Amino acid sequence: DQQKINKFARNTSRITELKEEIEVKKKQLQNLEDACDDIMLADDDCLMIPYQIGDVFISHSQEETQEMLEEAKKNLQEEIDALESRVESIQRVLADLKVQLYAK
Amino acid sequence: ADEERAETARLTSFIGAIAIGDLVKSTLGPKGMDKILLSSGRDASLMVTNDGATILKNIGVDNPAAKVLVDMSRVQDDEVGDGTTSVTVLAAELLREAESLIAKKIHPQTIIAGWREATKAAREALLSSAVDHGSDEVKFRQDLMNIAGTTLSSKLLTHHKDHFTKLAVEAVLRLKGSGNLEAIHIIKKLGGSLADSYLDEGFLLDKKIGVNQPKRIENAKILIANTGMDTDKIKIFGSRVRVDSTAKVAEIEHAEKEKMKEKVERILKHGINCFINRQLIYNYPEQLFGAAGVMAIEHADFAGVERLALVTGGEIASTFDHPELVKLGSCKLIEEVMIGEDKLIHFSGVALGEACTIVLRGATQQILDEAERSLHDALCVLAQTVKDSRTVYGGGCSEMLMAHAVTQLANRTPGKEAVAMESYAKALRMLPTIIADNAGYDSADLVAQLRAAHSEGNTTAGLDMREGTIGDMAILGITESFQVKRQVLLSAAEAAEVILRVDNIIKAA
Amino acid sequence: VLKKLDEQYQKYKFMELNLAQKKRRLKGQIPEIKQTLEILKYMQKKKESTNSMETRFLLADNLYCKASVPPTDKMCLWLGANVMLEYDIDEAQALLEKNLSTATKNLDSLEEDLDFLRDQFTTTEVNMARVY
Amino acid sequence: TDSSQGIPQLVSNISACQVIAEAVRTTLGPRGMDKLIVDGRGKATISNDGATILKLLDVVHPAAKTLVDIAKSQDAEVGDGTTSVTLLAAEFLKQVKPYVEEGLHPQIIIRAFRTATQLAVNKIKEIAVTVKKADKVEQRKLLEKCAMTALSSKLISQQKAFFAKMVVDAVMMLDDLLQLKMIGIKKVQGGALEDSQLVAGVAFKKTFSYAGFEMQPKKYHNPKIALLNVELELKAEKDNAEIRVHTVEDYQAIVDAEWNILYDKLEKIHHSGAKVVLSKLPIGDVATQYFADRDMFCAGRVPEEDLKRTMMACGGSIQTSVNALSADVLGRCQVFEETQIGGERYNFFTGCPKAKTCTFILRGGAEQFMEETERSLHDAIMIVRRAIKNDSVVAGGGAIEMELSKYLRDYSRTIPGKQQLLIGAYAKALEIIPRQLCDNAGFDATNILNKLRARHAQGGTWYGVDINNEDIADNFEAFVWEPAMVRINALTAASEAACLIVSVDETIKNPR
Amino acid sequence: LHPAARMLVELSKAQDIEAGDGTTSVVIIAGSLLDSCTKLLQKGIHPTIISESFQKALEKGIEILTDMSRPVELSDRETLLNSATTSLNSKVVSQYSSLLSPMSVNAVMKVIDPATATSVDLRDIKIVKKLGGTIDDCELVEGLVLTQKVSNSGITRVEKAKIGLIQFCLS
Amino acid sequence: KSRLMGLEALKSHIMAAKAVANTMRTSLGPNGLDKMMVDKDGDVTVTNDGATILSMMDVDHQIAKLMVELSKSQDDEIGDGTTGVVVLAGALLEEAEQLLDRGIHPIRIADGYEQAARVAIEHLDKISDSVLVDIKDTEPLIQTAKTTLGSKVVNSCHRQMAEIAVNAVLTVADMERRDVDFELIKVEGKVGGRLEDTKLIKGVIVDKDFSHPQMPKKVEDAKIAILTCPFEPPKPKTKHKLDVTSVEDYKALQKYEKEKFEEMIQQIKETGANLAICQWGFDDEANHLLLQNNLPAVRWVGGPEIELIAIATGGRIVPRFSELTAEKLGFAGLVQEISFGTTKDKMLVIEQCKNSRAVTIFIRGGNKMIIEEAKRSLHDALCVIRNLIRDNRVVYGGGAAEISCALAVSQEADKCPTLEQYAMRAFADALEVIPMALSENSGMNPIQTMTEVRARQVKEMNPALGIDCLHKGTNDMKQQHVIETLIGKKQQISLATQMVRMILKIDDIRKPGESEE
Amino acid sequence: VEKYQQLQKDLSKSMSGRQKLEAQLTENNIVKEELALLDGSNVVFKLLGPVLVKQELGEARATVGKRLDYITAEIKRYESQLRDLERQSEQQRETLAQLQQE
């Protein structure tokens, strides 16, 4: 019975779960970003610009309408950097679990 | 593993190497026979050759004596040029002579020791046939047109040979003491006929650039470089690649327009009129080059750029590791001359008078590839003729000469070893039997006629094989190169003794 | 021996399905609590967002009626099981943030422990087989 | 279900048992025409005795399997006498085989087997002499003479007396039961035929020079021994490691951290207390850096067969596992030494807490004359360690076998009927060990037997043949000695298998 | 699949591309020459000798055959008309070659610029099928004749058109 | 089950031994005809050495399967003489059939073959006196390695090779009680320049890295920094992620790492050992930056290459950048750079006057094929000299000592007159097979060849006058200079009688269908 | 054989997004029935994410007209994707089945 391959099986499965979390956050990042550019291009401030918050609406400037989407893109991208900071940490154990099968 | 005994190995060496020697003696001589090519694998495609080297490439060789011959066939092919089919029959002519000795009782170390002494003795007889031709400009001009008909007709080109014969001997004449293949630029190109082929004094690139760039450059300064425009090379000027941000694209989009602007400033500060680039040149630096007078070449040849820095005295920029310390080439005239259907770049008046560019013009791909392979085999021999402007009298005339000298030494020495020297001098006379069979004549008559010639010492005349009659030597068209036979005599006597060395053959495959 | 390996392959695969029944119920809780915070925290009240705004009411899934909003300052949230209480912003805010933070951690802390509860089930069934 | 019965079944069992007796007929002699045995293994296997070769045979005759199992039962007790039970019982069946068609289909022989073998074992211990302390010996000259008896077979001049008294000492130190493989002589390139070294523990033949190999200690007072099972090197791992860069100091971190785990390999058992590092697998170039930096000795590519002998005498075991790395698995000694003999670094493990492997180390700088010395010593150990176990020692070499055949044709006269033909055949088979060694030493083999019977009609003291003096003599006065009990065991075992196979002429099979 | 037989299909193919006619006769001449080869190899003549003798006699035979021939015009359109159709009536198909002889005569006459009149490129001659129409309505249209056009809102008849080419993707 | 009894055993023992002895006897001496090999991968191989071919040939018989380990003992100890032990022992073997066909028992001759081996070894003590002083005896070894080189791999004897090869052995023998270890020396061969190029390296060699000639190409003081720690950024063959905040941050980063380059300098240089060598490699960007910063560094060094320089210097290796001392640095005698080959690049030769733990003869070639054939001539020349440096015992073999002991053993069949006389006769006539076989593969008549030196034994005993195999007509051993080690010929006596003893060891020749299957 | 399911999964994944278009295709025809009744009676906006942007009726007619055309562009490629993946795999069902047998 080997407990290092018990760590080796846990290590490779943690590689898989991290990369999938990056991909779903990248598609949400471009979805908000391309939602910014389309609504600015059509009809800036003429009388009022209604903006959806559920089923009630607020009327204000065109650039503030982007600004709510701009913040969520900032929060999402900082996660993507932190996700890849965990993708890097799951690779260092992978180079070291090969020796620990010979050590203990 | 299968341990082949010596009694079995001699039978295998005799069926292995001689049958290969049967094939190359067919495809010897322009009057000689040919060989159908049968592919050893499935779906056998057929070609008809007058070359034995291609036979080894198509038909697989797995005879252990004959696989030694494949190594010998490669050496005369690459390092020597012509003499591929000649060295392989000649070792087989030796091995046939060894058969009766093996049939008697005779050890091969008798046969080896005799042929080693007989080779060196005939080598001095080969040096006796060394006659200079660089003593005159005209006789060296007469020397080059002699051998140019010999190699090209030996490697399947005799119909438009004479148009290539006039052009090739001119470029070798400018080499003047130094044999050069890195000064003779070899260009094949589809277009025109084989009478449309061209010789440029200098260097050539097949670039159609028109009138957007300067194509007429007088008193050129040539920068030989590999510096691209969109590749973002070494000596960084702006942004580099990075991750984990979304607003850093603006520094990358702006930095490309600065690097292409700066490399125009880099190229102009060389002072050149011609920027030769291995890579693609973008449209915005290209239009900045033609207005000032800087020639722009994109998609340059990987080997042509390196041969350009040699012929012009310049140097490669080493992928923009040298931004200014890279030296410049200089030539007289750069002219765009339409040769055939294509627009060509002619670097004329380069710093090397040795430097030339032959321009091959084939009407199809079938004639164009076979012309260059024969022409490259010719120019290697002609470059060796620049170092040693010497001939030996072909048509088996030198073959009759050295076999007499061995026969004289075989009739002064003959202890144990010169039983082989008697078999040696026959195998030298076995080669003119082939050419008389290549011409298709009485080989027993023509040899014994030629044996009667060199017996008293009639050496200035051997057999002109176009009629098979005896004719002039020391230049005839048939008087061959000194450099060829001294390599062919070296290898054929060598590997045939090595075949005699391998009796302890073991097959483990 | 491959024979001992083959019995542990089938006992590992069958216990994967029992885990997916529990994770999807943990999965189904997460977007429903996710909709509660982000819609509230952006509008924040009729009161907090500075009087009368616009609205297009949800009467159905495809039928929205446009009108002027102005309500009084309360939110009648829905608890479930014959219960509605009127609420305000401060009561509704801190409750759902706690339900927001747990529903991720209910999905995260269990999905590792389910992966080892599967490993308990596959290991248990093979040691009794090799002995008796 | 298949079956074959009667005499054509029975004789088919006999000649099947003859062929395996045709093989081993002089394998106790050093000579014959060799068979290396390759099986579906595909591997090369030779031997010096038949008993190892008999372990290689998958027998196809079940009656011949019975003669194996009795001989393996003789092999299981001593390790010798496997051939003796084999040849005697077959030559019984050889001489009985004509008598069967003459009418020895009855089992009247089986009464003649026991009455023969009861008298014989009453002669063996009777003619044998009990001696341990000093009855004719020096307490050592018993073990000296038998070792000089074995080392006189090959023509070692006077070093055989020097080689004797050394291997006497290896037996007395180890002595717990009849086991010889711990004494097993290591062929040593280097040394001379005049020096010879006895080791109270074990030794390692070869170890290779690594970085800082001579910068590791040579003198210990207690080697704390770790008998590791893994191969160390830096090129055993694969690299995928990742972390963020803002400087070049991060470049030092990825390479050093892959070296600490290699340094973590050794420090776990070094902090457990171990100082001696041993692996039959190689040590890495970077891995042997820390071993010289630890200032603890390492030795890679040591023999695993020599590594097993360390487990017994030192109280050690096999090593690195996932857990339980402590002093409970380590081995101990009291003296470490590394003496380069020839050109190899040759290690000394002595001072062991357990006398479980006492090997003798022979030198000479050879392979052929030293193998001549070893094989005589391997049988010299087999005699003298059994000579300790049994105080009563008889003379070997067919001395007593010819005496029994003298005794029993006389007893054939006293026996009536068909059973005297058994006793005549019983006395017939006894000569079989003289039949080979006379033709091995070079003799008219039968005419020797005729000579030995006259010296039993006139003397009858110990008269047999010599293979090493190459004549006929009294083998006790020629000092060819071995304890009498294994002969008595062989007399019972050869009588047991022979009467059993002839008792079966009816064999039942099931091909389903 | 035989190498002598695989030269035969090459022999007629060269007769197809150089002439297109005499492709049956180019088969029969080669097997006739092989009958001459068997006599001389049984006689004991080297094939190198038999090769160069035939290459001389080939050059020699066409010289005497040229004297047998009579010179005809290549710039007179009418002389080309009489010369072609007499061969066309000599061949099997002349049922449609009657009206289609002078159409071909007017076609080549446009590319007969000199009197030397080189061999002919069929690599400017395009054959275009029209599904209906009549053999009487077959004619010569200059330039090139294209198949089905695909015009979404495009023009049908453009005067002084610019012929363009597209070699790039839109997706 | 088939049992091949006695003669029927020995007929199986004939046919493989008849095959392998006949393929060796065509290969004795410089007139030895070469052995060809097609591999199991179908690869052409041509040697003249048996220990190569017996390792390469797929052995298929108990006799043949023996010959791998039998020729293993000869080549590892002695070197040359792989053919002669096979020719001799098979010639006793085929004669032993004739004795068994005469009715002579196979055991009594196998008893006498060992005693026949004793009196031959007894004769070699009288043959060819054993005193050759250290400065002089290099020259017959210069002549002996001339014979191995000048006829087999190169027709005209590279003089620089045979004279360096006798000098590498005195480098190790003096430190090792007049003996050499074959792991303290190594025949190192790297083609790329000229086949005439041959050097002796007291340590090891590494290819010295310089990235630009505009940056200084240095070599300095005799101390090497045997490092695995980074003096230059290393590369364990993987990839991080790259991210910088600004371009001007990367502009300062070049100024930051330049101070970090000097810190790796000022740590190493204050300890000593200015030639820095690190195991993991790097590109040429910061390589010539460190060359500009005035310390040379070698990149992309092989794994075990840091170990062999450590034992050659005798010192240790520096594991980490924070652990810094001079005992973990190299202790070298000379560190100088010499160009690798003639045309491509340069090495860094690290010689030591301290530890001869890796003394490597370094040869070059203009052909890849010739160098292992050259090294195989050098492998056996470095094994025969190990015999001489211990004891200066030499033999004039090749036809002199073969006919000499064949006189003696045949005389010892008469002096010691008993049963082993035909065993000694089977030993003595088999000794004559060898100088026959030197003339059999030669062009000379071997039947004439055994006659001449036999008359010389009537003339003179203990001959330094045996046959030639250079066909010079001068039959000597001291003026033909064909001289070998007495230990090597004596080892060939032990090995040949070992094999005949080995095939005699059990009497079992029965199989279950599987004893060679 | 993994090559059997791989060509099927690459085909079936394209079909699922294609079946999404067909309900959109019908409702793109529904809105053109409703835009034809509007001529200024009711203006239209555009629902695009969290922002509801003003349109015109001619702006609406081109908008759903484009999205009608983008669906038909993805229909025709699948007809190429259908016949290619069913014919390539049909060749694979004969050859790759023989690989597992011998």
Curated annotation (Swiss-Prot), chain B:
The modification Phosphoserine is found at S45, S245. There is a cross-link at K233 (Glycyl lysine isopeptide (Lys-Gly) (interchain with G-Cter in SUMO2)). The modification Phosphothreonine is found at T246. The lineage of its organism: Eukaryota, Metazoa, Chordata, Craniata, Vertebrata. Component of the chaperonin-containing T-complex (TRiC), a hexadecamer composed of two identical back-to-back stacked rings enclosing a protein folding chamber. Each ring is made up of eight different subunits: TCP1/CCT1, CCT2, CCT3, CCT4, CCT5, CCT6A/CCT6, CCT7, CCT8. Interacts with PACRG. Interacts with FLCN. Interacts with DLEC1. Interacts with SVEP1. Component of the chaperonin-containing T-complex (TRiC), a molecular chaperone complex that assists the folding of actin, tubulin and other proteins upon ATP hydrolysis. The TRiC complex mediates the folding of WRAP53/TCAB1, thereby regulating telomere maintenance. As part of the TRiC complex may play a role in the assembly of BBSome, a complex involved in ciliogenesis regulating transports vesicles to the cilia. It comes from Homo sapiens (Human). This is T-complex protein 1 subunit beta. Its EC number is 3.6.1.-.
From Swiss-Prot, chain D:
SUPFAM superfamilies: GroEL apical domain-like (SSF52029), GroEL equatorial domain-like (SSF48592), GroEL-intermediate domain like (SSF54849). PROSITE patterns: TCP1_1, TCP1_2, TCP1_3. Keywords: Acetylation, ATP-binding, Chaperone, Cytoplasm, Hydrolase, Isopeptide bond, Methylation, Nucleotide-binding, Ubl conjugation. Mg(2+) binds at D80. There is a cross-link at K418 (Glycyl lysine isopeptide (Lys-Gly) (interchain with G-Cter in SUMO2)). Belongs to the TCP-1 chaperonin family. It is linked to De novo genetic variants in nearly every subunit of the TRiC complex, including CCT7, have been found in individuals with a broad spectrum of brain malformations, and clinical phenotypes ranging from mild to severe epilepsy, developmental delay, intellectual disability, ataxia, and other features of cerebral malfunction. Component of the chaperonin-containing T-complex (TRiC), a hexadecamer composed of two identical back-to-back stacked rings enclosing a protein folding chamber. Each ring is made up of eight different subunits: TCP1/CCT1, CCT2, CCT3, CCT4, CCT5, CCT6A/CCT6, CCT7, CCT8. Interacts with PACRG. Interacts with DLEC1. This is T-complex protein 1 subunit eta. It comes from Homo sapiens (Human).
Curated annotation (Swiss-Prot), chain E:
Mg(2+) binds at D21. The modification Phosphoserine is found at S101, S119. ADP binds at G22, T23, T24, S25, N89, S90, K91. It is found in: Cytoplasm; Melanosome; Cytoplasm, Cytoskeleton, Microtubule organizing center, Centrosome; Cytoplasm, Cytoskeleton, Cilium basal body. It comes from the Eukaryota. ATP binds at G22, T23, K91. Belongs to the TCP-1 chaperonin family. It is linked to De novo genetic variants in nearly every subunit of the TRiC complex, including CCT4, have been found in individuals with a broad spectrum of brain malformations, and clinical phenotypes ranging from mild to severe epilepsy, developmental delay, intellectual disability, ataxia, and other features of cerebral malfunction. This is T-complex protein 1 subunit delta. It comes from Homo sapiens (Human).
From Swiss-Prot, chain F:
CDD domains: TCP1_epsilon. Its EC number is 3.6.1.-. InterPro entries: Chap_CCT_epsi, Chaperone_TCP-1, Chaperonin_TCP-1_CS, Cpn60/GroEL/TCP-1, GroEL-like_apical_dom_sf, GROEL-like_equatorial_sf, TCP-1-like_intermed_sf, TCP-1_chaperonin. Changing K152R: Found in a patient with severe developmental delay, intellectual disability, pyramidal and cerebellar signs, visual impairment, polymicrogyria and pontocerebellar hypoplasia; uncertain significance; the orthologous yeast mutation induces yeast lethality suggesting loss of function. ADP binds at G29, G81, T82, T83, S151, G398, D468, E484, K489. It is found in: Cytoplasm; Cytoplasm, Cytoskeleton, Microtubule organizing center, Centrosome. Ubiquitinated by the DCX(DCAF12) complex specifically recognizes the diglutamate (Glu-Glu) at the C-terminus, leading to its degradation. Transmembrane segments: none annotated. The modification Phosphoserine is found at S2, S322, S515. It comes from the Eukaryota. NCBIfam families: chap_CCT_epsi (TIGR02343), thermosome_alpha (NF041082), thermosome_beta (NF041083). This is T-complex protein 1 subunit epsilon. It comes from Homo sapiens (Human).
